[PDB]
Amino acid sequence: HMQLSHRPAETGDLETVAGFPQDRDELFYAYPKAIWPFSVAQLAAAIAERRGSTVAVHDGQVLGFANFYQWQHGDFCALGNMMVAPAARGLGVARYLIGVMENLAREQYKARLMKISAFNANAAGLLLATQLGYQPRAIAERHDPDGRRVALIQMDKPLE
């Protein structure tokens, strides 16, 4: 069914990926420093600052995007910017990309651990990470775009 492949993100993918977040909450979950409306320029700025920007493809469509927020050779990487096409939610795209990013963290960065953090309102992300073997380690206070306090739940998982 949902055959998925991956490759590094390319300039040609920017518009498509920038179309993924459907509301301010979704943008905040994936890219908390971004400002709504999202734009190719904001996506390109993240890609420049980060590593490992990767897309997931199915039936000739880019359906997902992720990168590393943090990377420390021999130590850990932290997942960032997970976005999924609105017509492909709940089909395994985020799960698939997390596995790809785990492999890349192991292979390229010799990471022993992957970190995933999710904002408290992002139930789906918390639950998916839990399904994939991530455990919560800490909770940090953050603020949303309206200045309201939110909880960032910081999870991790050993790699192999």
Ligand X SMILES: O=C(N[C@H](CO)[C@H](O)c1ccc([N+](=O)[O-])cc1)C(Cl)Cl
Q: Which residues bind ligand X (CB under 6 A)?
A: 20-21, 26-27, 29-30, 41, 44-45, 48, 82-84, 89, 94, 122, 124-125, 128
For 61-88, give one letter per residue: b (16+ CB within 10 A) or e. Answer: ebbbbbbbbebeeeebbbbbbbbbbeeb
Nearer to ligand X, 33 or 74 (CB): 33
Q: Give the residue among 85, 78, 82, 64 at the shortest CA–CA distance from 125.
A: 82
Choice between 94 and 101, CB closer to ligand X? 94
Nearest CB to ligand X, comparing residues 83 and 101: 83
- Shortest Å, Cβ 108 to ligand X: 21
124 — phi, psi (to 5°)? -60, -40
* Cβ nearer to ligand X, comparing 10 with 75: 10
State how far the Cα of 24 lies from the Cα of 35, in Å rounded to an integer: 8
Residue 98 or 104 having the CB closest to ligand X = 98
Query: Residue 143 Cβ, how far from ligand X at the closest point, in Å?
Result: 18
Q: How far is the CB of 110 from ligand X (least distance, A)?
A: 26
Least distance CB 99 / ligand X (angstroms)? 13
CB atoms within 10 A of CB 106: 15
Cβ-based neighbours of 107, under 8 Å, separated by 6 or more = none
Q: How far is the CB of 159 from ligand X (least distance, A)?
A: 19
For residues 138 and 111, give the distance between their C-alpha atoms in angstroms, rounded to a whole number.
20
